[PDB]
RNA sequence: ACAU
DNA sequence: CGATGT
């Protein structure tokens, strides 16, 4: 219904899909970028939100915040309520880099506690999400 | 269908 | 127009 200022924002942004992935973390209120990712040669749009959900989990229990994140991705909300990436995205050579990642998201989902709400940036009441990359 |  | 996902 209304949106909760006091968060975190996160989103991907890509150059192809399969192809480059980065993602980004902000501050709702402000737009303040408070991480961003170097880009992946080769990854899906789904890992790559996931990624910036977990690295925002990651973000926010190292600085003691409570704060909610925000994420537009339907997939990567439940990926990251599983535990479990659930990507069709083929494992070879190349995708090394990115499947190293969200195996390593995926650990470390496993392994620590949060009590960070997850909840979806509702895009058609409230415009894009304040991380989007204004690609689209 | 919905979400990217 | 194409892709990733539930
Ligand atoms: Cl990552
Ligand atoms: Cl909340
Ligand atoms: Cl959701
Ligand atoms: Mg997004
Ligand atoms: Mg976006
Ligand atoms: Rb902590
Ligand atoms: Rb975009
Ligand atoms: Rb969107
Ligand atoms: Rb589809």
Do not use: C
């Not at 470390?108 to 991380?131: C, F, M, R, S, V």
């Amino acid at each position: 219904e209304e949106i909760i200022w006091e968060s975190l924002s996160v989103d991907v942004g890509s150059q192809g899909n399969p192809g480059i992935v980065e993602y980004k973390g902000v501050d709702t209120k402000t737009g303040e970028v408070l991480f961003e990712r170097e880009p992946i040669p080769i990854g899906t749009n789904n890992m790559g939100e996931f990624l910036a959900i977990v690295h925002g989990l990651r973000y926010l229990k190292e600085r003691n915040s409570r704060k909610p994140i925000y994420s537009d991705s339907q997939t990567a909300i439940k990926w990251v309520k599983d535990k479990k990436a659930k990507s069709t995205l083929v494992r070879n050579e190349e995708t090394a880099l990115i499947w190293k990642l969200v195996d390593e998201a995926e650990e470390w989902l496993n392994t620590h506690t949060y009590e960070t709400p997850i909840l979806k940036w509702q895009t058609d009441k409230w415009g894009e999400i304040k991380a989007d990359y204004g690609r689209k």
